[PDB]
Amino acid sequence: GPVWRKHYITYRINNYTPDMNREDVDYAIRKAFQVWSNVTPLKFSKINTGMADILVVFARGAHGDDHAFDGKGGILAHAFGPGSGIGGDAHFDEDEFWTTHSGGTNLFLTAVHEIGHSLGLGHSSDPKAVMFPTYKYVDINTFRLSADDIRGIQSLYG
Numbered sequence: 836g837p838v839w840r841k842h843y844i845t846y847r848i849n850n851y852t853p854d855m856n857r858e859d860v861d862y863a864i865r866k867a868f869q870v871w872s873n874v875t876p877l878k879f880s881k882i883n884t885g886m887a888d889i890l891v892v893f894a895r896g897a898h899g900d901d902h903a904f905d906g907k908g909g910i911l912a913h914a915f916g917p918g919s920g921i922g923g924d925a926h927f928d929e930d931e932f933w934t935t936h937s938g939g940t941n942l943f944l945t946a947v948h949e950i951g952h953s954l955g956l957g958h959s960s961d962p963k964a965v966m967f968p969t970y971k972y973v974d975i976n977t978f979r980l981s982a983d984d985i986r987g988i989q990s991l992y993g
């Protein structure tokens with residue numbers, strides 16, 4: 836399907852969850868982008884004003900697209916594949932409790948998966964893949980993409 840046709844990609848954080856320290860949100864998102872730039876030719880840059888390729892949004896319930904959120908649990912986040920406008924954007928359900936650790940829902944881990952979608956990946960049937968569509972906490976300090984994730988992304992880029 837669709838991929839970004841350029842190497843320099845921008846992101847912007849639209850708003851911040853009150854669940855976390857601001858700096859921790861910035862760092863979780865930055866690290867999640869780094870996971871993918873590690874294994875592709877892409878470069879990601881945070882911008883503070885204007886139109887970014889990938890807008891990161893925290894919202895609850897109905898929030899202006901065809902993917903209303905469902906309160907605590909269930910759908911944690913969703914993202915749109917590469918394209919103009921809302922293409923690339925990643926939305927996180929504010930009815931979750933976002934964290935830097937094993938409590939609540941880990942923002943970094945969720946964001947790695949969502950950014951996969953923002954870059955054009957679909958879901959994997961392999962439970963070991965970050966793109967497996969079921970949330971399960973794993974240690975973030977030593978996180979690695981599965982072989983399936985790497986072959987998926989390198990089928991699109993590089």
Ligand SMILES: O=NC(=O)CNS(=O)(=O)c1ccc(F)cc1
Nearest residue numbers: 910911912913945948968969970
């Ligand atoms: O992209 N959104 C989805 O696939 C919807 N499922 S999810 O929110 O439980 C979810 C989100 C992110 C994960 F890493 C795992 C599960």
Ligand SMILES: [Ca+2]
Nearest residue numbers: 906908910928
């Ligand atoms: Ca939810």
Ligand SMILES: [Ca+2]
Nearest residue numbers: 888920921922
């Ligand atoms: Ca966009």
Ligand SMILES: [Ca+2]
Nearest residue numbers: 854929931932
């Ligand atoms: Ca919340």
Ligand SMILES: [Zn+2]
Nearest residue numbers: 898900902926
């Ligand atoms: Zn949405």
Ligand SMILES: [Zn+2]
Nearest residue numbers: 948952958968
């Ligand atoms: Zn998904």
